[PDB]
Design an enzyme around this catalytic site. Structure first.
Site, PDB file in Angstrom:
ATOM      1  N   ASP A  25       5.957 -11.720  -4.437  1.00 15.31           N
ATOM      2  CA  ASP A  25       7.101 -11.344  -3.604  1.00 15.31           C
ATOM      3  C   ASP A  25       8.398 -11.955  -4.166  1.00 15.31           C
ATOM      4  OD1 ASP A  25       8.901 -10.619  -1.628  1.00 15.31           O
ATOM      5  OD2 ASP A  25       7.619 -11.310   0.047  1.00 15.31           O
ATOM      6  N   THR A  26       9.125 -11.175  -4.974  1.00 14.44           N
ATOM      7  CA  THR A  26      10.373 -11.673  -5.617  1.00 14.44           C
ATOM      8  C   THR A  26      11.479 -11.911  -4.558  1.00 14.44           C
ATOM      9  OG1 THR A  26      11.067  -9.388  -6.105  1.00 14.44           O
ATOM     10  CG2 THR A  26       9.938 -10.607  -7.861  1.00 14.44           C
ATOM     11  N   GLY A  27      11.302 -11.333  -3.393  1.00 17.53           N
ATOM     12  CA  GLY A  27      12.293 -11.474  -2.283  1.00 17.53           C
ATOM     13  C   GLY A  27      12.075 -12.739  -1.431  1.00 17.53           C
TER      14      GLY A  27
HETATM   15  C1  LIG Z   1      13.628 -18.924   4.750  1.00 18.82           C
HETATM   16  C2  LIG Z   1      14.202 -18.444   3.441  1.00 18.82           C
HETATM   17  C3  LIG Z   1      14.583 -17.037   3.289  1.00 18.82           C
HETATM   18  N1  LIG Z   1      13.468 -16.215   3.651  1.00 18.82           N
HETATM   19  C4  LIG Z   1      12.658 -15.765   2.776  1.00 18.82           C
HETATM   20  O1  LIG Z   1      12.771 -15.987   1.549  1.00 18.82           O
HETATM   21  C5  LIG Z   1      11.470 -14.861   3.357  1.00 18.82           C
HETATM   22  N2  LIG Z   1      11.483 -13.549   2.612  1.00 18.82           N
HETATM   23  C6  LIG Z   1      11.290 -12.384   3.253  1.00 18.82           C
HETATM   24  O2  LIG Z   1      11.078 -12.295   4.467  1.00 18.82           O
HETATM   25  C7  LIG Z   1      11.354 -11.084   2.325  1.00 18.82           C
HETATM   26  O3  LIG Z   1      11.155 -11.452   0.971  1.00 18.82           O
HETATM   27  C8  LIG Z   1      10.312 -10.096   2.735  1.00 18.82           C
HETATM   28  C9  LIG Z   1       8.961 -10.626   2.448  1.00 18.82           C
HETATM   29  C10 LIG Z   1       8.048  -9.481   2.188  1.00 18.82           C
HETATM   30  N3  LIG Z   1       7.569  -8.889   3.446  1.00 18.82           N
HETATM   31  C11 LIG Z   1       6.188  -9.045   3.442  1.00 18.82           C
HETATM   32  C12 LIG Z   1       5.520  -8.537   4.675  1.00 18.82           C
HETATM   33  C13 LIG Z   1       4.674  -7.402   4.607  1.00 18.82           C
HETATM   34  C14 LIG Z   1       4.042  -6.929   5.770  1.00 18.82           C
HETATM   35  C15 LIG Z   1       4.255  -7.581   6.984  1.00 18.82           C
HETATM   36  C16 LIG Z   1       3.616  -7.121   8.174  1.00 18.82           C
HETATM   37  C17 LIG Z   1       2.279  -6.641   8.083  1.00 18.82           C
HETATM   38  C18 LIG Z   1       1.606  -6.189   9.210  1.00 18.82           C
HETATM   39  N4  LIG Z   1       2.228  -6.203  10.436  1.00 18.82           N
HETATM   40  C19 LIG Z   1       3.552  -6.679  10.549  1.00 18.82           C
HETATM   41  C20 LIG Z   1       4.246  -7.146   9.388  1.00 18.82           C
HETATM   42  C21 LIG Z   1       5.080  -8.689   7.033  1.00 18.82           C
HETATM   43  C22 LIG Z   1       5.714  -9.165   5.870  1.00 18.82           C
HETATM   44  N5  LIG Z   1       7.772  -7.745   3.449  1.00 18.82           N
HETATM   45  C23 LIG Z   1       8.666  -7.250   4.357  1.00 18.82           C
HETATM   46  O4  LIG Z   1       9.290  -7.947   5.191  1.00 18.82           O
HETATM   47  C24 LIG Z   1       8.839  -5.721   4.282  1.00 18.82           C
HETATM   48  N6  LIG Z   1       7.788  -5.119   5.103  1.00 18.82           N
HETATM   49  C25 LIG Z   1       6.898  -4.353   4.593  1.00 18.82           C
HETATM   50  O5  LIG Z   1       6.918  -4.103   3.373  1.00 18.82           O
HETATM   51  O6  LIG Z   1       5.902  -3.800   5.421  1.00 18.82           O
HETATM   52  C26 LIG Z   1       4.815  -3.329   4.648  1.00 18.82           C
HETATM   53  C27 LIG Z   1      10.240  -5.256   4.800  1.00 18.82           C
HETATM   54  C28 LIG Z   1      11.357  -6.023   4.059  1.00 18.82           C
HETATM   55  C29 LIG Z   1      10.391  -3.704   4.523  1.00 18.82           C
HETATM   56  C30 LIG Z   1      10.351  -5.517   6.333  1.00 18.82           C
HETATM   57  C31 LIG Z   1      12.791 -10.397   2.484  1.00 18.82           C
HETATM   58  C32 LIG Z   1      13.783 -11.396   2.740  1.00 18.82           C
HETATM   59  C33 LIG Z   1      14.395 -12.050   1.682  1.00 18.82           C
HETATM   60  C34 LIG Z   1      15.374 -13.037   1.929  1.00 18.82           C
HETATM   61  C35 LIG Z   1      15.729 -13.355   3.244  1.00 18.82           C
HETATM   62  C36 LIG Z   1      16.724 -14.358   3.509  1.00 18.82           C
HETATM   63  C37 LIG Z   1      17.980 -14.044   2.781  1.00 18.82           C
HETATM   64  C38 LIG Z   1      19.320 -14.413   3.393  1.00 18.82           C
HETATM   65  C39 LIG Z   1      15.106 -12.690   4.311  1.00 18.82           C
HETATM   66  C40 LIG Z   1      14.138 -11.714   4.061  1.00 18.82           C
HETATM   67  C41 LIG Z   1      10.022 -15.639   3.232  1.00 18.82           C
HETATM   68  C42 LIG Z   1       8.872 -14.616   3.086  1.00 18.82           C
HETATM   69  C43 LIG Z   1      10.028 -16.610   2.016  1.00 18.82           C
END
Ligand SMILES: C=CCNC(=O)[C@@H](NC(=O)[C@@](O)(CCCN(Cc1ccc(-c2ccncc2)cc1)NC(=O)[C@@H](NC(=O)OC)C(C)(C)C)Cc1ccc(CC=C)cc1)C(C)C
Ligand SMILES: [Cl-]
Ligand SMILES: [Cl-]
Ligand SMILES: [Cl-]
EC number: 3.4.23.16
Lengths: 99, 99
Positions: A25-27
């Site tokens: 997860d590069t994000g």
């Molecule tokens: C506290 C420091 C900043 N926060 C972060 O770095 C966090 N990163 C993330 O949440 C992020 O990289 C997304 C993670 C990947 N996530 C992973 C993920 C995947 C599925 C779920 C999920 C599964 C089943 N049911 C509910 C949710 C939850 C999380 N996927 C999704 O959220 C995606 N969702 C999906 O792709 O759905 C398939 C989507 C963006 C479209 C909502 C996107 C992101 C990146 C940066 C920031 C903060 C920037 C100011 C907020 C969000 C955590 C994981 C380290």
């Protein structure tokens, strides 16, 4: 390897004596795993994403293995809906985005 | 380019003639942008992140430039913490993970 993004980039990791599947997860700043036990000290943390924040436990200096690449780093543990490998460990195995 | 992950992979995108910053996010199925105006009709979608679920507006077949690379595809609009470019557009611009 070269990993395509047609599908979710899932890999096996080894951590704390366990095998788990996790998303590259590069994000993500941080690596976050579903509830599990890890040794040593920890401190509470809130981390945020789409949908808001969850409370996790932060463990530092944890050995991990990802596709045969050993690394060490911080691992967050808590009620994440899915296991994610974040940039803090992706750097250590030399992972890049390319296009 | 080749982008390392020691910092957040933020890039410039262009959509509706405007430049924005967005995060290249291999952990995201979909692309979601902060509130903005887009043409045409939209459909409802619920998406899940680390914090839980949000409702977004889904626009289809939207032109968008990512690091100068032209794509046309689905863009979601809603209360996201950052603009995120997900795999649906990362695949259009030929992005892979490598280590
Ligand atoms: C506290 C420091 C900043 N926060 C972060 O770095 C966090 N990163 C993330 O949440 C992020 O990289 C997304 C993670 C990947 N996530 C992973 C993920 C995947 C599925 C779920 C999920 C599964 C089943 N049911 C509910 C949710 C939850 C999380 N996927 C999704 O959220 C995606 N969702 C999906 O792709 O759905 C398939 C989507 C963006 C479209 C909502 C996107 C992101 C990146 C940066 C920031 C903060 C920037 C100011 C907020 C969000 C955590 C994981 C380290
Ligand atoms: Cl670390
Ligand atoms: Cl490097
Ligand atoms: Cl699309």
């Amino acid at each position: 390897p070269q990993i395509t993004l047609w599908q979710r980039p899932l890999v096996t990791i080894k951590i704390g004596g366990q095998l788990k599947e996790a998303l590259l997860d590069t994000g993500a700043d941080d690596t976050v795993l579903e509830e599990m036990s890890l040794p040593g000290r920890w401190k509470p943390k809130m981390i945020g994403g789409i949908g808001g924040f969850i409370k996790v436990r932060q463990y530092d200096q944890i050995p991990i293995e990802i596709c045969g690449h050993k690394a060490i780093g911080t691992v967050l543990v808590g009620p994440t809906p899915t296991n994610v490998i974040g940039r803090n460990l992706l750097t250590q195995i030399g992972c890049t985005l390319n296009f």
